PDB file of C-alpha atoms and ligand atoms in Angstrom:
ATOM      1  CA  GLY A   1      45.591  47.633  27.624  1.00  0.00           C
ATOM      2  CA  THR A   2      43.002  48.121  24.892  1.00  0.00           C
ATOM      3  CA  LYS A   3      45.589  47.617  22.081  1.00  0.00           C
ATOM      4  CA  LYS A   4      44.733  44.017  21.143  1.00  0.00           C
ATOM      5  CA  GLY A   5      42.106  43.528  18.421  1.00  0.00           C
ATOM      6  CA  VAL A   6      41.377  41.425  15.374  1.00  0.00           C
ATOM      7  CA  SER A   7      39.850  41.627  11.929  1.00  0.00           C
ATOM      8  CA  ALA A   8      36.821  39.303  11.722  1.00  0.00           C
ATOM      9  CA  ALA A   9      34.077  37.981   9.464  1.00  0.00           C
ATOM     10  CA  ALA A  10      30.852  36.303  10.576  1.00  0.00           C
ATOM     11  CA  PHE A  11      31.390  32.607  10.915  1.00  0.00           C
ATOM     12  CA  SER A  12      29.606  30.295  13.273  1.00  0.00           C
ATOM     13  CA  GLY A  13      31.205  30.937  16.695  1.00  0.00           C
ATOM     14  CA  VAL A  14      32.606  34.460  15.985  1.00  0.00           C
ATOM     15  CA  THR A  15      31.090  36.015  19.184  1.00  0.00           C
ATOM     16  CA  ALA A  16      32.599  33.246  21.334  1.00  0.00           C
ATOM     17  CA  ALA A  17      35.952  33.511  19.484  1.00  0.00           C
ATOM     18  CA  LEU A  18      36.149  37.331  20.007  1.00  0.00           C
ATOM     19  CA  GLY A  19      35.437  36.942  23.726  1.00  0.00           C
ATOM     20  CA  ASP A  20      37.774  33.925  24.183  1.00  0.00           C
ATOM     21  CA  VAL A  21      40.746  35.622  22.500  1.00  0.00           C
ATOM     22  CA  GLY A  22      40.286  38.814  24.598  1.00  0.00           C
ATOM     23  CA  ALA A  23      39.853  41.177  21.619  1.00  0.00           C
ATOM     24  CA  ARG A  24      39.274  44.753  22.965  1.00  0.00           C
ATOM     25  CA  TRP A  25      38.300  45.932  19.455  1.00  0.00           C
ATOM     26  CA  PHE A  26      37.568  44.514  16.031  1.00  0.00           C
ATOM     27  CA  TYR A  27      36.823  45.575  12.490  1.00  0.00           C
ATOM     28  CA  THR A  28      35.205  43.913   9.453  1.00  0.00           C
ATOM     29  CA  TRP A  29      36.538  46.010   6.477  1.00  0.00           C
ATOM     30  CA  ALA A  30      32.957  47.478   6.386  1.00  0.00           C
ATOM     31  CA  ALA A  31      30.917  50.361   7.880  1.00  0.00           C
ATOM     32  CA  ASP A  32      29.114  47.973  10.311  1.00  0.00           C
ATOM     33  CA  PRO A  33      29.789  44.648  12.066  1.00  0.00           C
ATOM     34  CA  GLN A  34      28.599  42.554   9.049  1.00  0.00           C
ATOM     35  CA  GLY A  35      26.322  40.335  11.146  1.00  0.00           C
ATOM     36  CA  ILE A  36      28.773  39.950  14.094  1.00  0.00           C
ATOM     37  CA  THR A  37      27.385  40.381  17.600  1.00  0.00           C
ATOM     38  CA  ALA A  38      30.314  41.813  19.637  1.00  0.00           C
ATOM     39  CA  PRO A  39      30.861  40.609  23.177  1.00  0.00           C
ATOM     40  CA  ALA A  40      30.608  43.204  25.980  1.00  0.00           C
ATOM     41  CA  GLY A  41      33.859  45.246  26.107  1.00  0.00           C
ATOM     42  CA  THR A  42      34.789  44.579  22.424  1.00  0.00           C
ATOM     43  CA  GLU A  43      34.673  47.873  20.441  1.00  0.00           C
ATOM     44  CA  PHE A  44      33.665  47.826  16.722  1.00  0.00           C
ATOM     45  CA  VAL A  45      35.687  50.187  14.450  1.00  0.00           C
ATOM     46  CA  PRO A  46      33.984  50.986  11.118  1.00  0.00           C
ATOM     47  CA  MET A  47      35.866  51.206   7.804  1.00  0.00           C
ATOM     48  CA  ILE A  48      35.171  53.127   4.576  1.00  0.00           C
ATOM     49  CA  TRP A  49      36.815  50.585   2.277  1.00  0.00           C
ATOM     50  CA  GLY A  50      36.979  52.304  -1.149  1.00  0.00           C
ATOM     51  CA  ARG A  51      35.748  55.087  -3.456  1.00  0.00           C
ATOM     52  CA  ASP A  52      32.213  53.584  -3.711  1.00  0.00           C
ATOM     53  CA  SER A  53      31.964  53.347   0.148  1.00  0.00           C
ATOM     54  CA  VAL A  54      31.834  57.186   0.373  1.00  0.00           C
ATOM     55  CA  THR A  55      28.053  57.842   0.550  1.00  0.00           C
ATOM     56  CA  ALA A  56      25.988  59.864   3.092  1.00  0.00           C
ATOM     57  CA  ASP A  57      24.302  56.471   4.010  1.00  0.00           C
ATOM     58  CA  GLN A  58      27.605  54.561   4.645  1.00  0.00           C
ATOM     59  CA  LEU A  59      29.081  57.537   6.631  1.00  0.00           C
ATOM     60  CA  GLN A  60      25.917  57.876   8.845  1.00  0.00           C
ATOM     61  CA  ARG A  61      25.966  54.016   9.344  1.00  0.00           C
ATOM     62  CA  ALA A  62      29.640  54.160  10.332  1.00  0.00           C
ATOM     63  CA  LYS A  63      29.056  57.015  12.844  1.00  0.00           C
ATOM     64  CA  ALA A  64      26.101  55.058  14.374  1.00  0.00           C
ATOM     65  CA  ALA A  65      28.240  51.855  14.706  1.00  0.00           C
ATOM     66  CA  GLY A  66      31.385  53.330  16.316  1.00  0.00           C
ATOM     67  CA  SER A  67      33.450  56.375  17.251  1.00  0.00           C
ATOM     68  CA  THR A  68      36.684  55.796  15.242  1.00  0.00           C
ATOM     69  CA  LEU A  69      36.717  55.536  11.426  1.00  0.00           C
ATOM     70  CA  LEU A  70      39.278  53.686   9.279  1.00  0.00           C
ATOM     71  CA  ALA A  71      39.647  54.933   5.689  1.00  0.00           C
ATOM     72  CA  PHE A  72      40.372  53.081   2.446  1.00  0.00           C
ATOM     73  CA  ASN A  73      41.931  49.584   2.380  1.00  0.00           C
ATOM     74  CA  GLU A  74      45.195  49.304   0.304  1.00  0.00           C
ATOM     75  CA  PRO A  75      44.375  52.120  -2.211  1.00  0.00           C
ATOM     76  CA  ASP A  76      47.950  51.521  -3.541  1.00  0.00           C
ATOM     77  CA  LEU A  77      46.918  48.049  -4.879  1.00  0.00           C
ATOM     78  CA  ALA A  78      44.921  47.363  -8.059  1.00  0.00           C
ATOM     79  CA  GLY A  79      43.341  44.310  -6.314  1.00  0.00           C
ATOM     80  CA  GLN A  80      42.044  46.438  -3.367  1.00  0.00           C
ATOM     81  CA  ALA A  81      40.681  50.029  -3.109  1.00  0.00           C
ATOM     82  CA  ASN A  82      42.763  50.930  -6.252  1.00  0.00           C
ATOM     83  CA  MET A  83      42.596  54.744  -5.679  1.00  0.00           C
ATOM     84  CA  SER A  84      44.975  57.599  -6.618  1.00  0.00           C
ATOM     85  CA  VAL A  85      46.154  59.874  -3.804  1.00  0.00           C
ATOM     86  CA  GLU A  86      44.214  62.702  -5.574  1.00  0.00           C
ATOM     87  CA  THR A  87      40.901  60.682  -5.454  1.00  0.00           C
ATOM     88  CA  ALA A  88      41.455  59.795  -1.756  1.00  0.00           C
ATOM     89  CA  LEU A  89      42.166  63.460  -0.902  1.00  0.00           C
ATOM     90  CA  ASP A  90      39.159  64.709  -2.907  1.00  0.00           C
ATOM     91  CA  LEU A  91      36.833  62.288  -0.913  1.00  0.00           C
ATOM     92  CA  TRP A  92      38.596  63.032   2.415  1.00  0.00           C
ATOM     93  CA  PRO A  93      36.300  65.954   3.418  1.00  0.00           C
ATOM     94  CA  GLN A  94      33.235  63.573   3.565  1.00  0.00           C
ATOM     95  CA  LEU A  95      35.103  61.282   6.046  1.00  0.00           C
ATOM     96  CA  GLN A  96      36.431  64.275   8.008  1.00  0.00           C
ATOM     97  CA  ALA A  97      32.891  65.745   8.276  1.00  0.00           C
ATOM     98  CA  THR A  98      31.758  62.761  10.424  1.00  0.00           C
ATOM     99  CA  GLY A  99      33.817  64.298  13.258  1.00  0.00           C
ATOM    100  CA  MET A 100      35.108  60.812  14.173  1.00  0.00           C
ATOM    101  CA  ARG A 101      38.730  60.009  15.071  1.00  0.00           C
ATOM    102  CA  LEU A 102      40.011  59.310  11.557  1.00  0.00           C
ATOM    103  CA  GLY A 103      42.633  56.896  10.277  1.00  0.00           C
ATOM    104  CA  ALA A 104      44.580  57.355   7.036  1.00  0.00           C
ATOM    105  CA  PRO A 105      44.052  54.899   4.214  1.00  0.00           C
ATOM    106  CA  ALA A 106      45.995  51.686   5.073  1.00  0.00           C
ATOM    107  CA  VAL A 107      48.696  51.208   2.425  1.00  0.00           C
ATOM    108  CA  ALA A 108      49.771  47.630   1.603  1.00  0.00           C
ATOM    109  CA  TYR A 109      53.485  48.632   1.842  1.00  0.00           C
ATOM    110  CA  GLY A 110      56.006  51.432   1.490  1.00  0.00           C
ATOM    111  CA  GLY A 111      54.382  53.727   4.056  1.00  0.00           C
ATOM    112  CA  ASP A 112      57.791  55.205   4.932  1.00  0.00           C
ATOM    113  CA  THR A 113      58.965  55.537   1.255  1.00  0.00           C
ATOM    114  CA  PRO A 114      59.477  59.182   0.106  1.00  0.00           C
ATOM    115  CA  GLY A 115      57.075  59.833  -2.806  1.00  0.00           C
ATOM    116  CA  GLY A 116      55.117  56.629  -2.095  1.00  0.00           C
ATOM    117  CA  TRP A 117      51.328  56.505  -1.774  1.00  0.00           C
ATOM    118  CA  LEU A 118      51.133  57.326   1.972  1.00  0.00           C
ATOM    119  CA  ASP A 119      53.829  60.036   1.702  1.00  0.00           C
ATOM    120  CA  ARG A 120      51.965  61.836  -1.114  1.00  0.00           C
ATOM    121  CA  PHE A 121      48.641  61.398   0.761  1.00  0.00           C
ATOM    122  CA  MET A 122      50.031  62.842   4.029  1.00  0.00           C
ATOM    123  CA  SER A 123      51.817  65.735   2.200  1.00  0.00           C
ATOM    124  CA  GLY A 124      48.562  66.581   0.262  1.00  0.00           C
ATOM    125  CA  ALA A 125      46.488  66.375   3.423  1.00  0.00           C
ATOM    126  CA  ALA A 126      48.868  68.800   5.228  1.00  0.00           C
ATOM    127  CA  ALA A 127      48.794  71.222   2.250  1.00  0.00           C
ATOM    128  CA  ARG A 128      44.952  71.122   2.205  1.00  0.00           C
ATOM    129  CA  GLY A 129      44.691  71.620   6.042  1.00  0.00           C
ATOM    130  CA  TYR A 130      43.072  68.184   6.441  1.00  0.00           C
ATOM    131  CA  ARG A 131      42.931  66.136   9.635  1.00  0.00           C
ATOM    132  CA  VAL A 132      44.525  62.669   9.796  1.00  0.00           C
ATOM    133  CA  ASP A 133      44.458  61.440  13.443  1.00  0.00           C
ATOM    134  CA  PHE A 134      46.375  58.148  13.104  1.00  0.00           C
ATOM    135  CA  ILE A 135      47.950  55.942  10.466  1.00  0.00           C
ATOM    136  CA  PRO A 136      46.907  52.315  10.140  1.00  0.00           C
ATOM    137  CA  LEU A 137      49.494  50.004   8.521  1.00  0.00           C
ATOM    138  CA  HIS A 138      49.653  46.495   7.036  1.00  0.00           C
ATOM    139  CA  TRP A 139      52.708  44.279   7.434  1.00  0.00           C
ATOM    140  CA  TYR A 140      53.339  40.739   6.179  1.00  0.00           C
ATOM    141  CA  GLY A 141      56.791  39.322   7.022  1.00  0.00           C
ATOM    142  CA  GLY A 142      58.566  36.877   4.642  1.00  0.00           C
ATOM    143  CA  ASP A 143      61.387  36.112   7.163  1.00  0.00           C
ATOM    144  CA  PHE A 144      59.887  33.541   9.531  1.00  0.00           C
ATOM    145  CA  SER A 145      62.813  33.629  12.030  1.00  0.00           C
ATOM    146  CA  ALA A 146      62.952  35.314  15.507  1.00  0.00           C
ATOM    147  CA  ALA A 147      64.240  38.400  13.518  1.00  0.00           C
ATOM    148  CA  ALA A 148      60.688  39.056  12.243  1.00  0.00           C
ATOM    149  CA  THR A 149      59.480  41.107  15.260  1.00  0.00           C
ATOM    150  CA  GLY A 150      62.382  43.552  14.906  1.00  0.00           C
ATOM    151  CA  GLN A 151      61.667  43.944  11.159  1.00  0.00           C
ATOM    152  CA  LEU A 152      57.995  44.759  11.942  1.00  0.00           C
ATOM    153  CA  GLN A 153      59.100  47.201  14.650  1.00  0.00           C
ATOM    154  CA  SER A 154      61.509  48.935  12.163  1.00  0.00           C
ATOM    155  CA  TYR A 155      58.659  49.562   9.701  1.00  0.00           C
ATOM    156  CA  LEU A 156      56.304  50.961  12.405  1.00  0.00           C
ATOM    157  CA  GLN A 157      59.135  53.195  13.746  1.00  0.00           C
ATOM    158  CA  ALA A 158      59.945  54.456  10.221  1.00  0.00           C
ATOM    159  CA  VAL A 159      56.362  55.486   9.599  1.00  0.00           C
ATOM    160  CA  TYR A 160      56.086  57.101  13.059  1.00  0.00           C
ATOM    161  CA  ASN A 161      59.344  58.990  12.392  1.00  0.00           C
ATOM    162  CA  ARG A 162      58.104  60.292   8.999  1.00  0.00           C
ATOM    163  CA  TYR A 163      54.543  61.564   9.917  1.00  0.00           C
ATOM    164  CA  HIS A 164      54.451  61.660  13.821  1.00  0.00           C
ATOM    165  CA  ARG A 165      50.933  60.209  13.942  1.00  0.00           C
ATOM    166  CA  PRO A 166      49.986  57.403  16.317  1.00  0.00           C
ATOM    167  CA  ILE A 167      50.176  54.004  14.560  1.00  0.00           C
ATOM    168  CA  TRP A 168      47.637  51.231  14.272  1.00  0.00           C
ATOM    169  CA  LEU A 169      48.679  47.862  12.840  1.00  0.00           C
ATOM    170  CA  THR A 170      45.346  46.838  11.271  1.00  0.00           C
ATOM    171  CA  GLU A 171      46.686  43.702   9.507  1.00  0.00           C
ATOM    172  CA  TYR A 172      49.828  41.708  10.278  1.00  0.00           C
ATOM    173  CA  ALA A 173      51.098  38.173  10.038  1.00  0.00           C
ATOM    174  CA  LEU A 174      53.987  36.160   8.652  1.00  0.00           C
ATOM    175  CA  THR A 175      53.195  35.645   4.955  1.00  0.00           C
ATOM    176  CA  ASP A 176      55.579  35.723   1.977  1.00  0.00           C
ATOM    177  CA  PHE A 177      53.792  37.022  -1.135  1.00  0.00           C
ATOM    178  CA  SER A 178      57.068  37.171  -3.192  1.00  0.00           C
ATOM    179  CA  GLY A 179      56.319  33.892  -5.091  1.00  0.00           C
ATOM    180  CA  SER A 180      53.560  32.662  -7.456  1.00  0.00           C
ATOM    181  CA  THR A 181      51.651  31.283  -4.459  1.00  0.00           C
ATOM    182  CA  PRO A 182      51.742  32.523  -0.861  1.00  0.00           C
ATOM    183  CA  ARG A 183      54.178  30.968   1.596  1.00  0.00           C
ATOM    184  CA  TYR A 184      53.246  30.516   5.257  1.00  0.00           C
ATOM    185  CA  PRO A 185      55.214  29.737   8.403  1.00  0.00           C
ATOM    186  CA  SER A 186      54.964  26.487  10.331  1.00  0.00           C
ATOM    187  CA  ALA A 187      52.421  26.512  13.174  1.00  0.00           C
ATOM    188  CA  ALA A 188      55.311  26.721  15.753  1.00  0.00           C
ATOM    189  CA  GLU A 189      56.997  29.596  13.903  1.00  0.00           C
ATOM    190  CA  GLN A 190      53.653  31.449  13.707  1.00  0.00           C
ATOM    191  CA  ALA A 191      52.835  30.954  17.400  1.00  0.00           C
ATOM    192  CA  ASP A 192      56.346  32.100  18.483  1.00  0.00           C
ATOM    193  CA  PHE A 193      55.938  35.188  16.259  1.00  0.00           C
ATOM    194  CA  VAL A 194      52.537  35.948  17.801  1.00  0.00           C
ATOM    195  CA  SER A 195      54.113  35.866  21.285  1.00  0.00           C
ATOM    196  CA  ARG A 196      57.186  37.976  20.437  1.00  0.00           C
ATOM    197  CA  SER A 197      55.349  40.494  18.198  1.00  0.00           C
ATOM    198  CA  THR A 198      52.524  41.130  20.703  1.00  0.00           C
ATOM    199  CA  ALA A 199      55.060  41.662  23.565  1.00  0.00           C
ATOM    200  CA  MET A 200      56.850  44.197  21.304  1.00  0.00           C
ATOM    201  CA  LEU A 201      53.633  45.985  20.267  1.00  0.00           C
ATOM    202  CA  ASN A 202      52.241  46.133  23.816  1.00  0.00           C
ATOM    203  CA  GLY A 203      55.436  48.033  24.860  1.00  0.00           C
ATOM    204  CA  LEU A 204      55.705  50.485  21.857  1.00  0.00           C
ATOM    205  CA  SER A 205      54.037  53.709  23.096  1.00  0.00           C
ATOM    206  CA  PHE A 206      53.221  55.168  19.610  1.00  0.00           C
ATOM    207  CA  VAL A 207      51.300  51.952  18.635  1.00  0.00           C
ATOM    208  CA  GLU A 208      47.713  52.505  19.903  1.00  0.00           C
ATOM    209  CA  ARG A 209      46.146  49.300  18.462  1.00  0.00           C
ATOM    210  CA  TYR A 210      47.063  46.089  16.586  1.00  0.00           C
ATOM    211  CA  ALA A 211      45.082  43.398  14.819  1.00  0.00           C
ATOM    212  CA  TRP A 212      46.449  39.990  13.715  1.00  0.00           C
ATOM    213  CA  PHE A 213      45.278  38.962  10.244  1.00  0.00           C
ATOM    214  CA  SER A 214      42.914  37.302  10.993  1.00  0.00           C
ATOM    215  CA  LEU A 215      40.559  35.779  13.624  1.00  0.00           C
ATOM    216  CA  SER A 216      39.337  32.816  11.495  1.00  0.00           C
ATOM    217  CA  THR A 217      40.973  30.177   9.350  1.00  0.00           C
ATOM    218  CA  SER A 218      37.895  30.615   7.073  1.00  0.00           C
ATOM    219  CA  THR A 219      39.432  34.035   6.168  1.00  0.00           C
ATOM    220  CA  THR A 220      43.107  32.967   5.836  1.00  0.00           C
ATOM    221  CA  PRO A 221      45.576  30.140   6.571  1.00  0.00           C
ATOM    222  CA  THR A 222      47.084  32.470   9.253  1.00  0.00           C
ATOM    223  CA  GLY A 223      43.742  32.395  11.130  1.00  0.00           C
ATOM    224  CA  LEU A 224      43.793  32.107  14.951  1.00  0.00           C
ATOM    225  CA  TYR A 225      40.552  30.049  15.394  1.00  0.00           C
ATOM    226  CA  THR A 226      38.625  27.369  13.531  1.00  0.00           C
ATOM    227  CA  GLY A 227      35.083  28.009  14.780  1.00  0.00           C
ATOM    228  CA  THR A 228      35.378  28.425  18.588  1.00  0.00           C
ATOM    229  CA  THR A 229      38.668  26.442  18.870  1.00  0.00           C
ATOM    230  CA  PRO A 230      41.959  28.352  19.052  1.00  0.00           C
ATOM    231  CA  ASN A 231      45.039  26.861  17.368  1.00  0.00           C
ATOM    232  CA  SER A 232      48.494  27.410  19.015  1.00  0.00           C
ATOM    233  CA  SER A 233      48.553  30.933  17.469  1.00  0.00           C
ATOM    234  CA  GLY A 234      45.079  31.749  18.908  1.00  0.00           C
ATOM    235  CA  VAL A 235      46.347  30.459  22.263  1.00  0.00           C
ATOM    236  CA  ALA A 236      49.432  32.762  22.007  1.00  0.00           C
ATOM    237  CA  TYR A 237      47.222  35.735  20.981  1.00  0.00           C
ATOM    238  CA  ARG A 238      44.799  35.084  23.873  1.00  0.00           C
ATOM    239  CA  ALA A 239      47.810  35.040  26.261  1.00  0.00           C
ATOM    240  CA  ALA A 240      49.059  38.470  24.932  1.00  0.00           C
ATOM    241  CA  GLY A 241      46.653  40.020  27.456  1.00  0.00           C
TER     242      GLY A 241
HETATM  243  O1  LIG B   1      32.004  49.726   0.350  1.00  0.00           O
HETATM  244  C1  LIG B   1      31.864  49.532  -1.063  1.00  0.00           C
HETATM  245  C2  LIG B   1      32.804  48.434  -1.562  1.00  0.00           C
HETATM  246  O2  LIG B   1      32.694  47.233  -0.762  1.00  0.00           O
HETATM  247  C3  LIG B   1      33.750  46.301  -1.090  1.00  0.00           C
HETATM  248  O3  LIG B   1      33.609  45.067  -0.420  1.00  0.00           O
HETATM  249  C4  LIG B   1      34.411  44.905   0.729  1.00  0.00           C
HETATM  250  C5  LIG B   1      35.537  43.965   0.330  1.00  0.00           C
HETATM  251  O4  LIG B   1      36.401  44.618  -0.603  1.00  0.00           O
HETATM  252  C6  LIG B   1      36.310  43.602   1.577  1.00  0.00           C
HETATM  253  O5  LIG B   1      37.305  42.654   1.250  1.00  0.00           O
HETATM  254  C7  LIG B   1      38.327  42.436   2.263  1.00  0.00           C
HETATM  255  C8  LIG B   1      39.666  42.653   1.597  1.00  0.00           C
HETATM  256  O6  LIG B   1      39.827  44.043   1.319  1.00  0.00           O
HETATM  257  C9  LIG B   1      40.803  42.123   2.504  1.00  0.00           C
HETATM  258  O7  LIG B   1      42.136  42.183   1.946  1.00  0.00           O
HETATM  259  O8  LIG B   1      40.624  40.779   2.816  1.00  0.00           O
HETATM  260  C10 LIG B   1      39.389  40.604   3.599  1.00  0.00           C
HETATM  261  C11 LIG B   1      39.313  39.204   4.176  1.00  0.00           C
HETATM  262  O9  LIG B   1      39.273  38.201   3.157  1.00  0.00           O
HETATM  263  C12 LIG B   1      38.168  40.968   2.796  1.00  0.00           C
HETATM  264  O10 LIG B   1      36.975  40.862   3.616  1.00  0.00           O
HETATM  265  O11 LIG B   1      35.458  43.014   2.560  1.00  0.00           O
HETATM  266  C13 LIG B   1      34.414  43.866   3.042  1.00  0.00           C
HETATM  267  C14 LIG B   1      33.723  42.956   4.052  1.00  0.00           C
HETATM  268  O12 LIG B   1      33.048  41.851   3.440  1.00  0.00           O
HETATM  269  C15 LIG B   1      33.535  44.374   1.881  1.00  0.00           C
HETATM  270  O13 LIG B   1      32.639  45.394   2.329  1.00  0.00           O
HETATM  271  C16 LIG B   1      33.770  46.021  -2.597  1.00  0.00           C
HETATM  272  O14 LIG B   1      34.864  45.134  -2.899  1.00  0.00           O
HETATM  273  C17 LIG B   1      33.828  47.273  -3.485  1.00  0.00           C
HETATM  274  O15 LIG B   1      33.733  46.937  -4.866  1.00  0.00           O
HETATM  275  C18 LIG B   1      32.695  48.211  -3.060  1.00  0.00           C
HETATM  276  O16 LIG B   1      32.764  49.479  -3.700  1.00  0.00           O
END
């Protein structure tokens, strides 16, 4: 359908790469496409990344660039938006007042955990009569076996069960962050995971959209393309339909 998207940055060849891979949507972690010209049929989704992104100017920019709005990126991490639940909720009315379909902040992990960041955000939002239309999630698997897709599915199901909001998977890949440096799968393991995970996500009715992290190897070792050339993972992602 229209589920398959990617995160992207401007690199030489990005327009070609978005069209080649069949991305129906994309985002840039910013309020506008950050210099990317989208192919026809590829929808841009703006993001309000952190506390300092919440300005009349950024919110007007976002509304001019797209119709769906993603909120803060990994507020639960000191290295990312680094925001208390209270701060996110206090800023929420400015994002709500755009009128756009509105995604929760994307937590790095523990979205299903009672008392965790997302739980306290969703409980506070309900108590304040706020609108949260969908929940975007991040998932990085450290088990590089064929079991990985079912572990991803379990997390998405858990979050769906807890808040009953449609799910977006705005970043996912196999990456183990448990050690002092990141661990990555082999190219074959990564391509097999792309195939099996996309088949799973295409069939899961409460997942509206997904986005592999990320389109370009300039962004991450789990990239799908180097310039306009897909690797075996890009090939598998293109084939996901
Ligand atoms: O909007 C105000 C705000 O902008 C922030 O800049 C963001 C970057 O934080 C963001 O970085 C992305 C990471 O969050 C993510 O994990 O990885 C990707 C890929 O490497 C990064 O792009 O990227 C967007 C797009 O360039 C920027 O707008 C500032 O960090 C923040 O201080 C400032 O308040």
